[PDB]
C-alpha cells in the first residue's frame, strides 16, 4: 500500500516538529506548513496514527529525559528542578496543541477522547509526578518543610505553593491527585503533631491559656493553607486541630483543678468563660460537656443553701458568656425547679 508508507512519512515530519518543541527549538518552526499536514491527516481518516503517535512521542520525552532530570536532582534543588520540568511541559504542550489544533478541534471532539492539554497532564502525572521514587521524595520534602515551619524555621512557601498547585491541575479539574499524594499523609502527620503539642500544653499551661492557644493554632493552620496549600484544605485541617486539641480532651479541660469551668464560675471570669463557649461550640458534645459540669456545680450550691442570689449570677453568665443559648437556659431553669422540689 502506497498510503501505508506515505502516511508514515507525513507523520515523521510532524514527529520531528513535536520533538523540536520539546527541545525549545520552536523559533524556526513554520505553523502554516505544519498545520496543513495535520489538517490533511484528519480529513483523510488518519487521525488515529496522529493521536497514537502523539502519545508515544510525549511518553518517550517524559520517561527518557524529564524523569531522569528529576531523579538526578533528588539531593540538590529537587522542587526547583521538578517545577521547571512542569513549566517546560506546559509550554511545550501549548505549542504542540498549537500545530495539532485541527486534531484538537475535529478528531478528539467527534471520537470522544482526551484533548492535547489533558493527554499531556496524564503522561506527566503517571510517568514523572506519580513515579515511584519522585512521588515518595515529593511527599517527604513537602511534609518536612511544614514540620520545620511548625518548629519555628523559615521555609520556601512559594515552592510548596507551586508543588500543591501542580498536584491540583494534574487531577484533571479535580483534587484526586492532591488528596492521595499530599492531603491524606499531611492530615495524618499533622494529627500526630497536634496530639503531642496537646499533651505539652495540658501539663505546662492553665485551662484558660489552653483555649487561647488552640484558637492561635486554628488561625495559624488557616494561614498555612491560604499561603502554601489549596484553600479546599482549610476545613479538613481545622477539623483535625479541633479533634486532637478539643474533642479528645473535652472533660479534661472543664475538670482542670483551680483553672477549669468550676473555678471560672466561682471567680466570675465572664470574658474568660466566654472564650471556652466560643471554642467548645466548634465540636460535637462540646457545649453538652460545659452544661453537665455547670449543672454539677449549680445543683450542689443550691443544695447548700438565698436562692435569688444564685439565679441572678447565673443569668449574668447566660447572657454575657453563653450568648443566651437555649441549652444553657433550660439547664439553669431545670436546676432551679429541682431546688423547689427539695422543700
Amino acid at each position: 500500500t502506497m498510503d501505508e508508507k506515505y502516511v508514515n512519512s507525513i507523520w515523521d515530519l510532524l514527529k520531528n516538529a513535536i520533538q523540536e518543541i520539546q527541545r525549545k527549538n520552536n523559533s524556526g518552526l513554520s505553523f502554516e506548513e505544519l498545520y496543513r499536514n495535520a489538517y490533511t491527516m484528519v480529513l483523510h481518516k488518519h487521525g488515529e496514527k496522529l493521536y497514537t503517535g502523539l502519545r508515544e512521542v510525549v511518553t518517550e520525552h517524559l520517561i527518557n529525559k524529564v524523569r531522569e532530570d528529576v531523579l538526578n536532582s533528588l539531593n540538590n534543588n529537587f522542587l526547583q528542578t521538578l517545577n521547571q520540568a512542569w513549566n517546560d511541559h506546559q509550554t511545550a504542550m501549548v505549542m504542540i496543541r498549537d500545530i495539532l489544533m485541527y486534531m484538537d478541534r475535529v478528531y478528539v471532539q467527534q471520537n470522544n477522547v482526551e484533548n492535547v492539554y489533558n493527554l499531556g497532564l496524564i503522561i506527566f502525572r503517571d510517568q514523572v509526578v506519580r513515579y515511584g521514587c519522585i512521588r515518595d521524595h515529593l511527599r517527604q520534602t513537602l511534609l518536612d518543610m511544614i514540620a520545620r515551619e511548625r518548629k519555628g524555621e523559615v521555609v520556601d512557601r512559594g515552592a510548596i505553593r507551586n508543588a500543591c498547585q501542580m498536584l491540583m491541575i494534574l487531577g484533571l479539574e479535580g483534587r484526586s491527585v492532591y488528596e492521595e499524594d499530599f492531603e491524606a499523609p499531611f492530615l495524618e502527620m499533622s494529627a500526630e503533631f497536634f496530639q503531642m503539642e496537646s499533651q505539652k500544653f495540658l501539663a505546662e499551661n492553665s485551662a484558660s491559656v489552653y483555649i487561647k492557644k488552640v484558637e492561635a493554632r486554628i488561625n495559624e493552620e488557616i494561614e498555612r493553607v491560604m499561603h502554601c496549600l489549596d484553600k479546599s484544605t482549610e476545613e479538613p485541617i481545622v477539623k483535625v486541630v479541633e479533634r486532637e486539641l478539643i474533642s479528645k480532651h473535652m472533660k479534661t479541660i472543664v475538670e482542670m483543678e483551680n483553672s477549669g469551668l468550676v473555678h471560672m464560675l466561682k471567680n466570675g471570669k465572664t470574658e474568660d468563660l466566654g472564650c471556652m463557649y466560643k471554642l467548645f461550640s466548634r465540636v460535637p458534645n462540646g457545649l453538652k460537656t460545659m452544661c453537665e459540669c455547670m449543672s454539677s456545680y449549680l445543683r450542689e450550691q443550691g443544695k447548700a443553701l438565698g436562692l435569688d442570689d444564685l439565679k441572678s449570677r447565673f443569668d449574668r453568665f447566660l447572657l454575657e458568656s453563653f450568648n443566651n443559648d437555649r441549652l444553657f437556659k433550660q439547664t439553669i431553669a431545670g436546676d432551679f425547679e429541682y431546688f423547689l422540689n427539695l422543700n
Binding site: 523559533s27 524556526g28 513554520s30 505553523f31 489544533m101 475535529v106
Partner: protein, 196 residues
C-alpha cells in the same frame, strides 16, 4: 447600553479606508487588507499564527491560495459587522474554509443553515461533501434524509455521483423508507443503469 455593534462598524469603516491595517491575505492574485487583532479574535488559526512562537508570526502577508476567494472574503466580512448572506450554493464552500480557519461563530451558522434547508434535492450532494471533509454531524443527517427519500432519489440527476461503498452503506440493514420489502435489488439496478 451595549455599543459592541457600533464599535465594530467604525473598525469595518477603518478597514475599507485602510486605517490601522497591519495584515494582508493573498489568494492567487487577490488581496484583502485587515487587522491582526480582529482576525485573531474570531478565527483561532490567526490567533495561533500571530502568537510570536513561530517564523510566520511576525509578517505582513499571509498566503491562502488553496482556499476559495469569495468564501475567505465573506468570512472576513462575517468577522466584521457584515452578516453572512447564506445560500444553498455557497454554504458548501464557506463551511470548508471556516473549518480550516477554525471560526466557531461561522462553523455553527453554516451547519445550522445546512441542517435546516436539508431537502431531498440537497441531501444527495451534502452526503458526498461530508464524506470528503469528515463531517460526521452532516454525514449522518444527509444519510437519514437520503434513506427517507430513497425511491425519489434513484431517478435524480445527482444519483450517479454516489460511490459503490455508499450504496452498500444505504442498503446494509434498515431505516430505508421502502413500503415493499423487495425494492432493494431494483435500487441497485437503477444505480448500475445511471453509473453504467
Amino acid at each position: 447600553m451595549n455599543n459592541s455593534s457600533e464599535l465594530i462598524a467604525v473598525i469595518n469603516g477603518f478597514r475599507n479606508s485602510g486605517r490601522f491595517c497591519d495584515i494582508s491575505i493573498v489568494i492567487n492574485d487577490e488581496r484583502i487588507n485587515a487587522h491582526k487583532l480582529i482576525l485573531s479574535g474570531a478565527s483561532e488559526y490567526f490567533s495561533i499564527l500571530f502568537s510570536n512562537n513561530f517564523i510566520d508570526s511576525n509578517e505582513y502577508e499571509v498566503n491562502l491560495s488553496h482556499l476559495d476567494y469569495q468564501s475567505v472574503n465573506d468570512l472576513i466580512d462575517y468577522i466584521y459587522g457584515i452578516p453572512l448572506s447564506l445560500t444553498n450554493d455557497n454554504v458548501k464552500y464557506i463551511l470548508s474554509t471556516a473549518d480550516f480557519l477554525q471560526i466557531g461563530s461561522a462553523i455553527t451558522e453554516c451547519e445550522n443553515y445546512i441542517l435546516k434547508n436539508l431537502c431531498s434535492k440537497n441531501c444527495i450532494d451534502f452526503y458526498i461533501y461530508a464524506d470528503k471533509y469528515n463531517n460526521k454531524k452532516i454525514e449522518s443527517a444527509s444519510f437519514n434524509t437520503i434513506l427517507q427519500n430513497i425511491l425519489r432519489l434513484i431517478n435524480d440527476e445527482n444519483f450517479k455521483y454516489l460511490t459503490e461503498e455508499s450504496m452498500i452503506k444505504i442498503l446494509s440493514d434498515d431505516m430505508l423508507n421502502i413500503k415493499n420489502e423487495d425494492f432493494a435489488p431494483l435500487i441497485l439496478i437503477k444505480w448500475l443503469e445511471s453509473t453504467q
